[PDB]
Design a protein around this ligand. Structure first.
Ligand SMILES: NC(=O)C1=CN([C@@H]2O[C@H](COP(=O)(O)OP(=O)(O)OC[C@H]3O[C@@H](n4cnc5c(N)ncnc54)[C@H](OP(=O)(O)O)[C@@H]3O)[C@@H](O)[C@H]2O)C=CC1
Ligand SMILES: NC(=O)C1=CN([C@@H]2O[C@H](COP(=O)(O)OP(=O)(O)OC[C@H]3O[C@@H](n4cnc5c(N)ncnc54)[C@H](OP(=O)(O)O)[C@@H]3O)[C@@H](O)[C@H]2O)C=CC1
Lengths: 310, 310
């Protein structure tokens, strides 16, 4: 009576956390080991570590359609943590080969595609090229709908390492030392979540009937913070006040067309989040929000998150 | 009265294992966090995991000489786990700046440079370009000695992941499925060691008076094996005999000059170990062999190592 789960993208940044959260949760956890990563020592040893915790290795390749069909026939639920970084080479769209395999296999009770960010259907007017991420996720969503595959879309929170640990400064992954940039006036609400919590929520929700064919939002109330509130958390932890510089929207987007395309996409996403507030510009009900659905998850607050950087 | 150890290359393949072994040994463990690393999330989070285990971050950059001086002033022993992959960019020689910093600093009881492989003064006859690695490690040894810095040189074993876990097949990091290449007659003795054992021995030797100004060998007796014996260990675990093809020396090296330079070096190193038996063609005393010196370390045998691949 354990739910059988296949994780595809098992050595990814969020993917490896989902693997471990599925194991802790008690799911019979299967991981797709692709032959193409056989010389990447950190991926190979990750898989060895998953085995020591009870994960079952499933060999398959996205170029071998029958291998993907065999893989998904072993489980009840599939979770994809496919990368989003190389949008111009359409790695989100690689998931379409998995959707086809799931359709042909017929047995999968639920599929969680690689979402875990902003809510794609709400991003219709996003800045290009950053817009491209949402199109591709939307194209995968439509592939899911057309095949009639039951689904859950996990959305709504900034990964804490990429937007809280650095006080949203972008240029590193650590808090700044003396000066900090405030984007806009810094009073736009942002949703931050420890990625291990996002992983726990994913493992709780993937066999929850309440979230069958639903969008689940990850919006822990204590972690809805403006950028200045985030900065003040850190200033209280350190005892030192940071010299602040406000950066107006127009100066943030200045000369964006001269940046490299990936940085252009990253700047666009940041703008929607921190200037327009896309993660908080709408309300969601407790019946579709993960912290209320799963109250036993004592999610990590941003003041406990930032302590590890002291 | 704890030994203060600084690790340079702390997020490296063997380096991160060294950090953890030093902590488990009880040393006061410092790790050099370089600013150039600040956007590589996996390194940033390794440093955070090290802190949680009690390591002390020490910021420094190889391009800031006095940051290196300051770092090395803090400790009694320095361990370098500098990379050896980019020998055409001389990254092994980057250690020379660290040696200058230790010389200026004057306080360092013992320096362990980035050795952990073939015994470099024994490789004067190695094939190019593969020999460049040992040349550069020799130049580092010179600077250490020319500056009077006390040292321990840790040498003599193949990293198990790169040469045991794949049955020495090179093309993958996992055992082969049905066929295996036997190099020569497969009767040449090779030394294999789990890299966590290599790190444990490193941590136990860095303040051992017996190994001050000595080369210490990692040659655990049950792990001195021919490639054929290694293969037969795997066949006994799986109950499947592999189909064997022997590759003669001349054919192994054929057309080496048409391969990419890093692969050329990889082949040359492999030849000395597996064809020429460079790791086992000489005798070493128990007083200069780590498994004798540190008999409390119950080193992993290659049958236990390979079990994790089943
Ligand atoms: N703040 C937020 O909310 C953020 C959200 N995200 C989103 O999370 C999801 C995953 O992103 P992330 O964890 O950073 O991804 P990663 O960059 O860590 O890649 C994850 C996995 O993608 C697989 N992968 C990459 N390329 C291919 C390919 N050509 N073919 C097959 N598999 C491939 C690999 O699986 P394998 O393990 O098999 O090798 C890889 O491990 C995305 O949808 C992303 O947009 C990401 C960062 C921030
Ligand atoms: N079978 C055997 O016996 C083998 C032995 N070895 C040897 O082990 C030793 C370490 O190798 P390995 O663990 O694979 O190395 P890695 O490839 O893991 O690199 C280790 C560290 O080197 C640092 N580094 C790399 N380039 C630079 C640079 N330009 N400037 C400053 N620092 C740099 C980085 O330290 P940081 O953490 O600060 O970023 C990196 O993490 C070498 O001597 C190698 O020859 C290697 C593999 C097989």
């Amino acid at each position: 009576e354990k739910t059988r789960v296949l994780v595809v993208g098992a050595t990814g940044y969020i993917g490896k956390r989902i693997v471990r959260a599925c194991l802790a949760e008690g799911h019979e956890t299967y991981v797709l080991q692709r032959p193409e990563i056989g010389l990447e020592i950190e991926k190979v040893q990750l898989f060895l570590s998953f085995k020591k915790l009870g994960a079952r290795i499933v060999e398959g390749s996205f170029s071998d359609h029958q291998s993907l069909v065999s893989a998904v026939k072993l489980v009840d639920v599939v979770v994809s943590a496919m990368s989003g970084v190389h949008f111009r080479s359409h790695n989100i769209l690689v998931q379409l080969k998995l959707v086809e395999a799931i359709k042909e296999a017929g047995n999968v009770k639920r599929f969680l595609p690689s979402e875990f960010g902003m809510d794609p259907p709400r991003m219709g007017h996003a800045l290009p090229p950053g817009r491209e991420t949402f199109d591709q996720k939307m194209e995968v969503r439509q592939a899911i709908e057309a095949a009639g595959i039951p689904y859950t879309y996990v959305v709504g929170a900034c990964f804490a390492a990429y937007f809280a640990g650095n006080l949203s400064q972008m240029v590193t992954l650590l808090p700044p030392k003396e000066k900090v940039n405030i984007y806009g006036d810094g009073n736009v609400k942002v949703v931050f979540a420890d990625e291990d919590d996002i992983a726990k929520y994913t493992a709780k929700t993937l066999n929850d009937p309440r979230t069958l064919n639903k969008t689940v939002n990850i919006r822990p109330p204590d972690n809805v913070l403006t950028q200045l509130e985030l900065v003040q958390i850190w200033e209280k932890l350190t005892g030192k006040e940071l010299e602040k510089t406000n950066i107006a929207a127009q100066d943030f987007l200045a000369n964006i067309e001269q940046m490299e395309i990936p940085h252009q996409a990253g700047i666009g996403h940041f703008y929607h989040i921190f200037y327009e507030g896309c993660l908080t510009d709408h309300e969601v009900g407790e019946d579709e929000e993960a912290s209320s659905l799963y109250p036993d998850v004592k999610y990590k607050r941003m003041d406990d998150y930032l302590r590890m950087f002291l």
